[PDB]
Design a protein around this motif. Structure first.
Motif, PDB file in Angstrom:
ATOM      1  N   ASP A 271     -23.280  27.401  64.253  1.00 43.16           N
ATOM      2  CA  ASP A 271     -24.466  28.176  63.875  1.00 43.16           C
ATOM      3  C   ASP A 271     -25.651  27.983  64.796  1.00 43.16           C
ATOM      4  OD1 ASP A 271     -24.465  25.549  62.598  1.00 43.16           O
ATOM      5  OD2 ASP A 271     -26.256  26.163  61.492  1.00 43.16           O
ATOM      6  N   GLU A 272     -26.442  29.045  64.930  1.00 45.97           N
ATOM      7  CA  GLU A 272     -27.847  28.925  65.353  1.00 45.97           C
ATOM      8  C   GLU A 272     -28.025  28.302  66.731  1.00 45.97           C
ATOM      9  OE1 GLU A 272     -29.602  27.131  61.796  1.00 45.97           O
ATOM     10  OE2 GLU A 272     -29.901  29.214  61.052  1.00 45.97           O
ATOM     11  N   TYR A 273     -27.341  28.854  67.725  1.00 48.31           N
ATOM     12  CA  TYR A 273     -27.433  28.391  69.102  1.00 48.31           C
ATOM     13  C   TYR A 273     -28.899  28.346  69.573  1.00 48.31           C
ATOM     14  CZ  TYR A 273     -26.185  27.356  73.844  1.00 48.31           C
ATOM     15  OH  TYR A 273     -26.050  26.668  75.035  1.00 48.31           O
TER      16      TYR A 273
ATOM     17  N   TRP B 120     -27.860  31.016  47.491  1.00 52.41           N
ATOM     18  CA  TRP B 120     -27.682  29.837  46.637  1.00 52.41           C
ATOM     19  C   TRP B 120     -28.199  28.543  47.257  1.00 52.41           C
ATOM     20  CZ3 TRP B 120     -22.004  31.450  47.215  1.00 52.41           C
ATOM     21  CH2 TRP B 120     -21.780  32.681  46.598  1.00 52.41           C
ATOM     22  N   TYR B 121     -28.772  28.622  48.449  1.00 54.83           N
ATOM     23  CA  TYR B 121     -29.233  27.428  49.165  1.00 54.83           C
ATOM     24  C   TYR B 121     -30.351  26.682  48.458  1.00 54.83           C
ATOM     25  CZ  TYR B 121     -26.963  28.247  53.806  1.00 54.83           C
ATOM     26  OH  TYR B 121     -26.066  28.307  54.851  1.00 54.83           O
ATOM     27  N   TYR B 122     -30.343  25.364  48.632  1.00 57.16           N
ATOM     28  CA  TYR B 122     -31.408  24.481  48.180  1.00 57.16           C
ATOM     29  C   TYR B 122     -31.716  23.474  49.289  1.00 57.16           C
ATOM     30  CZ  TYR B 122     -33.281  20.397  45.564  1.00 57.16           C
ATOM     31  OH  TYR B 122     -34.008  19.281  45.156  1.00 57.16           O
TER      32      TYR B 122
ATOM     33  N   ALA C 245     -30.929  19.219  54.050  1.00 52.91           N
ATOM     34  CA  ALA C 245     -31.953  18.169  54.188  1.00 52.91           C
ATOM     35  C   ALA C 245     -32.828  18.411  55.409  1.00 52.91           C
ATOM     36  CB  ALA C 245     -31.321  16.791  54.191  1.00 52.91           C
ATOM     37  N   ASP C 246     -33.248  19.666  55.591  1.00 55.73           N
ATOM     38  CA  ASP C 246     -34.090  20.074  56.708  1.00 55.73           C
ATOM     39  C   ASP C 246     -35.270  19.133  56.916  1.00 55.73           C
ATOM     40  OD1 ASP C 246     -32.532  22.351  55.818  1.00 55.73           O
ATOM     41  OD2 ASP C 246     -33.900  23.672  56.926  1.00 55.73           O
ATOM     42  N   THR C 247     -35.866  18.631  55.831  1.00 52.33           N
ATOM     43  CA  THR C 247     -36.888  17.569  55.912  1.00 52.33           C
ATOM     44  C   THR C 247     -36.223  16.315  55.354  1.00 52.33           C
ATOM     45  OG1 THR C 247     -38.641  19.170  55.596  1.00 52.33           O
ATOM     46  CG2 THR C 247     -39.186  16.860  55.087  1.00 52.33           C
TER      47      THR C 247
HETATM   48  C1  LIG Z   1     -25.575  27.582  58.503  1.00 54.92           C
HETATM   49  C2  LIG Z   1     -27.006  27.246  58.088  1.00 54.92           C
HETATM   50  O1  LIG Z   1     -27.380  27.329  56.927  1.00 54.92           O
HETATM   51  N1  LIG Z   1     -27.808  26.808  59.066  1.00 54.92           N
HETATM   52  C3  LIG Z   1     -29.170  26.342  58.804  1.00 54.92           C
HETATM   53  C4  LIG Z   1     -30.007  27.320  57.995  1.00 54.92           C
HETATM   54  N2  LIG Z   1     -30.365  28.450  58.539  1.00 54.92           N
HETATM   55  O2  LIG Z   1     -31.131  29.218  57.673  1.00 54.92           O
HETATM   56  C5  LIG Z   1     -31.988  30.088  58.261  1.00 54.92           C
HETATM   57  O3  LIG Z   1     -32.217  30.058  59.472  1.00 54.92           O
HETATM   58  N3  LIG Z   1     -32.465  30.963  57.385  1.00 54.92           N
HETATM   59  C6  LIG Z   1     -33.398  31.958  57.567  1.00 54.92           C
HETATM   60  C7  LIG Z   1     -33.724  32.538  58.765  1.00 54.92           C
HETATM   61  C8  LIG Z   1     -34.681  33.560  58.843  1.00 54.92           C
HETATM   62  C9  LIG Z   1     -35.347  33.993  57.702  1.00 54.92           C
HETATM   63  C10 LIG Z   1     -35.047  33.397  56.475  1.00 54.92           C
HETATM   64  C11 LIG Z   1     -34.084  32.405  56.455  1.00 54.92           C
HETATM   65  O4  LIG Z   1     -30.405  27.080  56.728  1.00 54.92           O
HETATM   66  C12 LIG Z   1     -30.296  25.703  56.166  1.00 54.92           C
HETATM   67  C13 LIG Z   1     -31.454  25.574  55.219  1.00 54.92           C
HETATM   68  O5  LIG Z   1     -32.722  25.759  55.866  1.00 54.92           O
HETATM   69  C14 LIG Z   1     -30.334  24.701  57.314  1.00 54.92           C
HETATM   70  O6  LIG Z   1     -30.302  23.403  56.752  1.00 54.92           O
HETATM   71  C15 LIG Z   1     -29.077  24.940  58.130  1.00 54.92           C
HETATM   72  O7  LIG Z   1     -28.953  23.929  59.145  1.00 54.92           O
END
Ligand SMILES: CC(=O)N[C@H]1/C(=N/OC(=O)Nc2ccccc2)O[C@H](CO)[C@@H](O)[C@@H]1O
Length: 435
Positions: free
Chosen positions: A182-184, A290-292, A340-342
């Motif tokens: 993901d996300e290069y 469904w993300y958290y 766990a972005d933060t």
């Molecule tokens: C596959 C994936 O979910 N990649 C990242 C991820 N990518 O999400 C986005 O880039 N979402 C997004 C992009 C533009 C506008 C709204 C959401 O979301 C997770 C939660 O933030 C990160 O933890 C992940 O590393």
């Protein structure tokens, strides 16, 4: 088609790459997964941070071997440079083997992720600590902290050998290995990395990376080959797979299962799930509805906050895949993901379990029922009934028979059938009357 629904995978994903989770915490998540009727834990261990160390981490690449103890020092340090978590740095091999076994004994699989060529901050750091030069991708002078340069043969060879080392460990104890993809270069390109990799084909002589996306396809395919050699099914996130629906750069290995998490956004035009299915890929619905993100715990607290995720669960069923173009997209299952972005955020088990429970309840026909209280109830029946009246004994035997005659493949939607049978048994036991 209750049987087709229950046969699907139901997966909880945990970002133990950015943030440390202990074996005890992970066992608790497995316990809840089992209780709520899930089939698998998807555990990211390489995702920005790298938080899983094999006993032998020696890596043969670049005409040499990098010594195990040096690779371990390099990774521990590199992960700490990303985030030095006061709770811990990594899981050990013994701990992972025990965790997989613990999960297996409860009928829960484990699917690891070791992410590349993006979300690999710690591996990039580790490579620099070993002495590999300039592993990071850069975009017009902006260096990515997260992404390897696919033109750097030494960095690429090391990374592939590292993935191979992990895949060899996971062989025979797991089924699927997520290579990520993901996300290069999302940091260095302001979330335009796939466009950047494709750009030189269409906009030559402008300084864009030559053969960028072609090299990415080759990289993805080589990781797929590596994973498959170990009898594992490779999986990857969707966003870079036929980005912009462009099939003209090459073809992705059909054996890559697609974790379909995004339908894209403005200026980030991903292939539809329709296209991916038609190209021959199986799809795991990983809808970001469904993300958290840990610590974003209520409305207003940011994107992927818990209230947003709970709303997504309520409004987007397990069968609703991103970007279908109106087509009927088959799925292998669904995966609810906690991130766990933060990573300094406090992990709250109760909030994660609420997310998990809501996903299970919203799609109850897909999730397995809970039989553990029924089995316990049976274990609590008095073994010897001779001293009780025939009428009261017959009632207990009939109530036991009724529990043991329950369909063993009930869904969470039918839990009350099991619970009623337990209550009836308990009543009959209470009504045992001494002769
Ligand atoms: C596959 C994936 O979910 N990649 C990242 C991820 N990518 O999400 C986005 O880039 N979402 C997004 C992009 C533009 C506008 C709204 C959401 O979301 C997770 C939660 O933030 C990160 O933890 C992940 O590393």
């Amino acid at each position: 088609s209750h049987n087709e629904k229950l046969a699907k995978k139901k997966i909880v994903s945990i970002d133990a790459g950015r943030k440390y989770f202990s074996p005890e915490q992970l066992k608790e998540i497995i316990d809840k997964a089992k209780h709520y009727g899930y089939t698998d834990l998807h555990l990211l261990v390489g995702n920005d941070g790298l938080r899983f160390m094999l006993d032998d981490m020696s890596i043969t690449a670049n005409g040499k071997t990098y010594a195990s103890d040096d690779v371990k020092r390099a990774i521990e340090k590199g992960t700490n440079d990303y985030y030095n978590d006061p709770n811990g740095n990594h899981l050990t091999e013994s701990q992972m083997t025990d965790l997989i076994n613990y999960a297996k004994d409860k009928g829960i699989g484990l699917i690891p992720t070791v992410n590349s060529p993006g979300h690999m901050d710690a591996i990039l750091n580790a490579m620099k600590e070993l002495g590999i030069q300039n592993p990071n991708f850069s975009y017009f002078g902006k260096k990515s902290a997260r992404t390897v340069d696919l033109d750097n043969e030494q960095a690429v060879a090391f990374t592939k050998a590292l993935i191979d080392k992990y895949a060899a460990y996971f062989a025979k104890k797991t089924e699927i290995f997520n290579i990520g993809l993901d996300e290069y270069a999302n940091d260095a390109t302001d979330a335009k990395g796939w466009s950047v990799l494709q750009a030189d084909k269409y906009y030559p002589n402008e300084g864009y990376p030559v053969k960028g996306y072609e090299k990415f396809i080759a990289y993805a395919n080589d990781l797929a080959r590596i994973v498959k050699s170990h009898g594992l099914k490779p999986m990857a996130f969707n966003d870079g797979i036929y980005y912009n629906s462009d099939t003209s750069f090459g073809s992705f290995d059909k054996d890559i299962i697609v974790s379909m998490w995004t339908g894209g956004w403005g200026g980030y035009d991903v292939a539809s799930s329709k296209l991916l299915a038609e190209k021959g890929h199986q799809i795991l619905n990983t809808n970001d509805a469904w993300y958290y993100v840990l610590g974003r715990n209520a409305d207003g607290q940011g994107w992927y906050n818990l209230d947003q995720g709970l709303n997504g669960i309520k409004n987007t069923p397990i069968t609703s895949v991103p970007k279908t173009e109106g087509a009927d997209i088959p799925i292998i299952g669904g995966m609810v993901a906690a991130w766990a972005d933060t990573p300094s955020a406090r992990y709250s088990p109760s909030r994660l379990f609420k997310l998990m429970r809501h996903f299970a309840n919203a799609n109850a026909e897909y999730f397995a029922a809970d039989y553990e209280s029924a089995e316990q109830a049976l274990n609590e029946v008095p073994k010897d009934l001779n001293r009780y009246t025939a009428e009261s004994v017959t009632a207990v035997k009939e109530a036991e028979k009724a529990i043991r005659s329950l369909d063993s493949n009930l869904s969470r939607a039918q839990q009350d059938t099991i619970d009623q049978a337990i209550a009836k048994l308990q009543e009959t036991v209470n009504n045992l009357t001494l002769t």
